[model samples]
Target: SGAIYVGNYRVVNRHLATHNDWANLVWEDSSRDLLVSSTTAQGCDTIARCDCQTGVYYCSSRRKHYPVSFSKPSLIFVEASEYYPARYQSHLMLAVGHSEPGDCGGILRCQHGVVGIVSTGGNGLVGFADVRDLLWLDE
Candidate 1:
């Protein structure tokens, strides 16, 4: 478990647990921007933020493994109004693919208002797709 600084208090231990192998931390800034951090077992950590009005945070990590063909995954935060077109915008699309050998792959997708993760084995391929509607108020 990890520790989160919440003003005068902190949340720790079992209070922070997820079925996924990744860990995320979210915090709101004075500008109403949402800051995010993701930690992974492979030591890949990342940080990202959503716009002020959106108030959301998106983060992910990609393990750096050689000869395994690991795809680089990215975390993206786009407005709900831009979700659809953003998928094809390319400028809004943050893609990370395998930079190594062996053909191992992974992908993270966010489209059609849903988000999902996909992984391919044997040849080393993995990825994620997200199409779930964005919820800005939950934060």
Candidate 2:
């Protein structure tokens, strides 16, 4: 389950054994430009996030944040968790979460489109998400 071609949209991560334990699931107004981390082959430690606007996105180790959602490329999930983490406008951002089983995913290009809808693996946990590509635009 892997594919890479960011910026113009060509990202993919698949595998659906469905490991559910989102710590109760109640993710609020999501707004992530990009957050990556991988390590799941039973190693247990996965993290994935994209953009948020009450679209729900969370999955933490010991609950870093847990509430998952994925569609073809249409984010229409809602929960309204409240906002207060503003400072992302596509200028540049390619963050990462937690996961260390080894080699999460690669090639996550960002042009500020916040592209990260589906890139996750099943219980066998084949995590992989660590990309960096930009021209330059920061304070």
Candidate 3:
């Protein structure tokens, strides 16, 4: 988006067309440690590295509280009703019966592993972008 600064470093954004709504990655100090302790996966090198657990949680840090709830894997074809003129992609999405709308862009983590990034959401379900499917630039 804009200049998202982490401490004194400016975060640079990168994208993949497969991800319809979110920035796939950011360029930053490779040595910096990103404390993603709450997520299940230690290193998200591949989709197989993560799994869907019974419970899922996600919420924008901009919000005051983090919300956790039950979730199940879903297809974009089925959950499109939650939004108008639903966009389609090969990427996987998750369906949560109850969640906040603006939580888009927040990390969606399952008890098993980090699931995806929050995308579009409304009505009955929330949308997510499979982080593993997003592009990666080899160092």
Top model number, lDDT: 3
Could you tell me which 10 consecutive residues in candidate 2 have the lowest summed lDDT? 130-139
Counting only residues 3 or more apart in sequence or on different chains, how many pairs clash (N, Cα, C under 3 Å) in candidate 3? 0
- Residue-wise lDDT of candidate 1 within 8-59, one digit each (tens)? 2222222122433124543322111112233432221121222211111122
Poorest stretch of ten by lDDT in candidate 3: 30-39
Candidate 2, residue 120: Cα displacement in angstroms equals 6.8
What is the lDDT of every predicted structure here? Answer: 0.25, 0.27, 0.39
Q: At residue 93, give the lDDT of candidate 1.
A: 22
Error of 3 at 24 (Å): 12
Q: Please provide, for model 3 over 22-128, each residue's C-alpha lDDT reduced to its tens digit, 9 standing for 90 to 100.
A: 23334322111111111122332222234454435445534433444534444455234333243443354656544454554455555444545565556766555
Cα lDDT tens digits for candidate 2, 45-117 = 1222334222222333323332332222322222222222323222222223333221223322232333233
> Which stretches of model 2 miss by more than 4 angstroms?
1-13, 17-57, 66-93, 100-139
| Backbone-clash count (model 1) | 34
Report the Cα lDDT for residue 49, model 1: 26
